[PDB]
Design a protein around this ligand. Structure first.
Ligand SMILES: *[C@H](C)[C@H]1/C(=C/c2[nH]c(/C=C3N=C(/C=C4\NC(=O)C(CC)=C4C)C(C)=C\3CCC(=O)O)c(CCC(=O)O)c2C)NC(=O)[C@@H]1C
Ligand SMILES: *[C@H](C)[C@H]1/C(=C/c2[nH]c(/C=C3N=C(/C=C4\NC(=O)C(CC)=C4C)C(C)=C\3CCC(=O)O)c(CCC(=O)O)c2C)NC(=O)[C@@H]1C
Lengths: 309, 306
């Protein structure tokens, strides 16, 4: 049941908007319902729209040029400007067979001159983290995980950061934790397997970093071309809305916002666990920082697998 | 020392402005800056020009904020009429804020963040390969460093150049494109690298020369400025004429040099030296990534001695 509704991914979070394009025609074959408002000035946006009508000439050309690379050759994000408004967005591209799917995340105008500076700064901080993991003496899973949650806490600014390990019966245990002062600790607690369905663990193998900005936000529908006789697969989107059971789960534990990083060993390939960030209030972090976190989690996974041996 | 610090020439691949640390107005500029930044009241660019007349408002605001600091480089700026974009690289000296401007292709502006992330990722992967090395073999450590830099930077030749106790140098590792003659193993006199150059490398850890044959450009300053403006910290500083000549005879038209400073007790261990047969330019984000790679390399060198 869970996998169907997560794979189709027809509901997104409202912090961004989504377009899907036909690789052959470059025209819009699906869009989220908030996309006309975000990207135009309400020359419309609908099924069949050409993207050269929406963005400035260098922007349209950069996206058009992405159509011609293999996915492993995609460099994200792309900085685009809207043609009428001048509004800037980060465009995050991925491919599913003959479709190109694009997530658009807003950028503040005063942030634009700092886009390269901020990207370098995020990766530099992550790189300094990697050196401290590596400097650590071997022999203690506990010290390794403490160092990791401490580094992530400083890098990401969330109220709570946990290392969550899966046991062989698939139930989980919180084995390391750092929080801001007032909060209730979860260190040492065990949780049922069913708190994280099989389908979610499966998706984490491919989508290694997941952000939920606000569990109470009103989700937005994706509309697709009525001519299509199948559903598009949108689960690779950075914007996919959380299933309502989990959004209800979040509100109950006063984690209004979250950032989760998969820890995949032998990347025998196995989901060892998760690094779980919670925030009491809504929180957004831009793509370059999440991208750096993905690499930090990869290196962490190498050290985890070393200690096992 | 006094025609590297008080020498007033830059390489022509970019241009330079210096601004007064209080008024924010132009107190020095390279002779190529008017055509590069305005396309040639008053001559649009001279002593006393206000940066609000040169750049779009978001661009000028971002530079005003930097004068208020802490520095994250580079800043992406657009010129006011042309919309012509540059990377602005900022540093401070006692009297002034100095800005090096390196051009960006207008149609590449959408990919600036993407390219910066990719540069740092490749350097971060190189860092993990150095770390995973079994300790004990200085040869293996240095061979790995030159291989990674070669792949990252795309230069024709990459060598590790070690300083001996008498300050003479030795090439102890090297990788080149096929068919180039090796220099591995050669010893060179201490005088090839004067002490003044060594002292600069302590502060400016990455130095790029795009084309030893390029015609250098003068920096003009107000003659009543109560101090002498130094260019030691500019990414654009011209090579000394002895070295421009030294490079031509050895068919290194372009170079990229990384200092290797241990106990960063502080001493210059050596250099990672990249050479190219033809002119070569690499953008600031890649040089910035190389700086961190060089610091991490220095730590492993220091470990090997001990
Ligand atoms: C509804 C009947 C059942 C249900 C479904 C469900 N859960 C998830 C996803 C996650 N569940 C967790 C669990 C935890 N988070 C924590 O912080 C802790 C320790 C305090 C636990 C145990 C996590 C981390 C996830 C991943 C969330 C993410 O991707 O950010 C899903 C998938 C949701 C989606 O839309 O991707 C579903 C469907 N949960 C229940 O408890 C019910 C039994
Ligand atoms: C002129 C009278 C003397 C002189 C001066 C001089 N040298 C440098 C700087 C450098 N010299 C070297 C030397 C080498 N490069 C190599 O590739 C090799 C081995 C194959 C050697 C021995 C290097 C690497 C530098 C640094 C250059 C840089 O910053 O990119 C300077 C500094 C130039 C400047 O303006 O910074 C000067 C003045 N060289 C001679 O040979 C004379 C004896």
């Amino acid at each position: 049941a869970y996998l169907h509704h997560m794979q189709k991914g027809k509901m997104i979070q409202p912090f961004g908007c989504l377009l899907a394009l036909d690789e052959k025609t470059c025209k819009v074959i699906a869009y989220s319902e908030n996309a006309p408002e975000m990207l135009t000035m309400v020359p419309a946006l609908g099924i069949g729209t050409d993207i050269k009508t929406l963005f400035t000439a260098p922007s349209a050309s950069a996206l058009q040029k992405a159509l011609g690379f293999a996915e492993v050759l995609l460099l994200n994000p792309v900085l685009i400007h809207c043609k009428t408004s001048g509004k800037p967005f980060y465009a995050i591209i991925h491919r599913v067979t003959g479709s190109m799917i694009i997530d658009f995340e807003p950028v503040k105008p005063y942030e634009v001159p700092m886009t390269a500076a901020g990207a370098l700064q995020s990766y530099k901080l992550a790189a300094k983290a990697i050196t401290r993991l590596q400097s650590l003496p071997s022999g203690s899973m506990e010290r390794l995980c403490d160092t990791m949650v401490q580094e992530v806490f400083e890098l990401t600014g969330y109220d709570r950061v946990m290392a969550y390990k899966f046991h062989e019966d698939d139930h989980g245990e919180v084995i390391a934790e750092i929080t801001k002062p007032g909060l209730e600790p979860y260190l040492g607690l065990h949780y049922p397997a069913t708190d994280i369905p099989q389908a979610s663990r499966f998706l984490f193998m491919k989508n290694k970093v997941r952000m939920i900005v606000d569990c109470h936000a009103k989700h937005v529908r994706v509309l697709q071309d009525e001519k299509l006789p199948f559903d598009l697969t949108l689960c690779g989107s950075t914007l996919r809305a959380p299933h309502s059971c989990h959004a209800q789960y979040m509100a109950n534990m006063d984690s209004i916002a979250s950032l989760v990083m998969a820890v995949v060993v032998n990347d025998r390939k196995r989901l060892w666990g998760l690094v779980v960030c919670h925030n009491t209030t809504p929180r957004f972090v831009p793509f370059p920082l999440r991208y750096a976190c993905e690499f930090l989690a990869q290196v962490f996974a190498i050290h985890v697998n070393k200690e096992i041996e």
